[PDB]
């Protein structure tokens, strides 16, 4: 009954969220051959070795100075005091020549990742964004294509094929020898994943009536949350990415074995002013949600606890949104939730160096504020719009959010090379501008 739908909804989350755990770009530094023998001969410490050799740029600039440059010093020659060998050769180390990492890099982690496996750092750092770009392109292409298959064959036949293709693609990607095969498998997996999720949700909506639509939507949200919580536990005992990929892919194959028209909304001056605002708000919130998730995943100092806390705090938002239905209007919660997601960004920009106690609270507040705003849009959509919803919604809204999601990773990851806080200003501006447009929704000349 509901168990299969809950399992499918839970298993959909890892496909979209596993970028945080699969590639986590641990700390790295340049490798110089011949230093191991000298270090082991007059051994002093295994953690302070880089303080005397590896270049460092504490104040700033460490991206391309301490992680992509090495000292071209003949360490083989036995002329050193094993305390300050560079000082003995010359009192000024600033004028020493530099160079590229001709051999490779050594990383600091007990597990492994894609970045560690393929040495995907330094001048190749832009290559990690392709991982999400290909998935989002597959999401865009699948939405316009899976509709044809359902009409060609049927709703029942397509689900088994999509599930089988997804299950095979997961294992094949787990057994990928080079980078290009990984990208192809990611594209195929994203396409089929969106297709089967769409088909399953449409079938579920067909089976369930509109009397308990709110209840089933809340159940789906909680199923997504609980599926996302259990992913943190699996990654704790399986540090290697191949094992984690196999464990995530296995259970899917395990349980496997005078009419309302779209042209009427753009001729009446009253209805034409509402749909545009609805699309604008949906696109804005869809962009900010993924932006903040990726930003938190790319700079967290404690990944597991922060992920768990955010997932837990995401739950009461749905309850609050359901409670506040019959007491007040619909623009006050929207405006308050949209304003709560900007001031959090402004504060996060200006947080002085402190502990992590404030950061978790502020991130949870922002996540709850974003979560509240999305539910209200869905409730209003269901309340005010005619019988034809499903197809036009899941097509137009998906194609609108996918084009933003294709470009979001490039902006998020490539705007931190000049300043670390630039995407935060963009998020703040988007949040503050999204709150000032909802005030035009009320109709004028309305007297009780």
């Amino acid at each position, epitope marked *: 009954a509901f168990l299969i739908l809950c399992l499918l909804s839970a298993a959909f989350a890892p496909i979209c969220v596993g970028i945080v755990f699969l590639g986590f770009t641990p700390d790295h530094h340049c490798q110089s051959p011949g230093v191991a023998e000298l270090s082991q001969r007059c051994g002093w410490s295994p953690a302070e070795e880089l303080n005397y050799t590896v270049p460092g740029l504490g104040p700033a600039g460490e991206a391309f100075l301490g992680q992509c440059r090495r000292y071209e010093v003949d360490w083989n020659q036995s002329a050193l005091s094993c305390v300050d060998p560079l000082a003995s050769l010359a009192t000024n180390r600033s004028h020493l020549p530099l160079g590229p990492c001709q051999d490779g890099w050594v990383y600091d982690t007990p597990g492994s990742s894609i970045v560690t496996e393929f040495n995907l750092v330094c001048a190749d750092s832009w290559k990690l964004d392709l991982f999400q770009s290909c998935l989002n392109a597959g999401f865009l292409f699948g939405s316009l294509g899976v509709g044809y298959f359902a009409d060609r064959f049927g709703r029942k036949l397509c689900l088994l094929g999509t599930v089988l293709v997804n299950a095979v693609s997961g294992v094949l990607m787990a057994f990928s020898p080079n980078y290009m095969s990984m990208l192809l498998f990611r594209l195929l997996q994203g396409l089929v994943s969106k297709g089967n999720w769409m088909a399953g949700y449409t079938l579920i909506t067909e089976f369930v009536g509109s*009397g308990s639509r709110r209840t089933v939507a809340i159940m789906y949200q909680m199923a997504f949350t609980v599926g996302l919580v259990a992913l943190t536990g699996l990654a704790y005992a399986l540090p290697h990415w191949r094992w984690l990929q196999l464990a995530v892919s296995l259970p899917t194959f395990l349980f496997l074995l005078l009419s309302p028209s779209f042209a009427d909304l753009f001729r009446t001056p009253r209805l034409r002013k509402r749909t545009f605002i609805l699309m604008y708000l949906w696109f804005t919130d869809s962009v900010l949600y993924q932006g903040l998730i990726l930003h938190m995943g790319a700079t967290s100092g404690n990944l597991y606890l922060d992920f768990l806390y955010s997932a837990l705090v995401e739950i009461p938002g749905a309850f609050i949104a359901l409670i506040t239905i019959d007491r007040v209007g619909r623009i006050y919660p929207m405006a308050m939730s949209n304003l709560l997601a900007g001031a959090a960004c402004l504060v996060m920009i200006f947080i002085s160096p402190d502990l992590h106690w404030l950061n978790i609270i502020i991130m949870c507040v922002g996540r709850m504020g974003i979560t509240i705003a999305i539910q209200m849009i869905c409730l209003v959509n269901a*309340e*005010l719009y005619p019988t034809f919803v499903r197809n036009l919604g899941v097509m137009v809204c998906s194609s609108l959010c996918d084009i933003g999601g294709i470009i979001t990773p490039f902006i998020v990851f490539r705007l931190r090379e000049v300043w670390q806080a630039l995407p935060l200003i963009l998020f703040a501006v988007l949040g503050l501008l999204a709150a000032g447009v909802t005030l035009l*929704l009320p*109709e004028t000349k309305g007297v*009780a």
Partner: nanobody, 118 residues
Framework: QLQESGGGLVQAGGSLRLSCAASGTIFYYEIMGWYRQAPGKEREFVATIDQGGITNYADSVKGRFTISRDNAKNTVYLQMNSLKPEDTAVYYC????????????????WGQGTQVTV
């Protein structure tokens, strides 16, 4: 163009039906409802209905009024039975405003109603 019909004069108790008619654009894109005037008093609330089908009722009339929505004749119906002598007023078919106020207190349309007595 909201137009109401129905409403006679029952001797003492009974059942009767009220009907409201829309144009075709109001029917398919927003929320309808029924209000009461209660002459000698202020405006009152009796019921609503929306596209999905979720309905709300007033506290004083819960369990006595039934509202149903048609789809072929572009009309909305109201069913009431087991009346009381205090239930006499004119009934307005109105379109509330959802985004402002509380959700059912601000109006933008009405149809002048019709009178029924008990």
């Amino acid at each position: 163009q909201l137009q109401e019909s129905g409403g006679g004069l029952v001797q003492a108790g009974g059942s009767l039906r009220l009907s409201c008619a829309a144009s075709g654009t109001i029917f398919y894109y927003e929320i309808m409802g029924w209000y009461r005037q209660a002459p000698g008093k202020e405006r009152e609330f009796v019921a609503t209905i929306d596209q999905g089908g979720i309905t709300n009722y007033a506290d004083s009339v819960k369990g006595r009024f039934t509202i149903s929505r048609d789809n072929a004749k572009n009309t909305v119906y109201l069913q009431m039975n087991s009346l009381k002598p205090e239930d006499t007023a004119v009934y307005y078919c109105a379109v509330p405003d959802v985004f402002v106020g509380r959700g059912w207190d601000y109006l933008i349309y009405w149809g002048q109603g019709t009178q029924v007595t008990v």
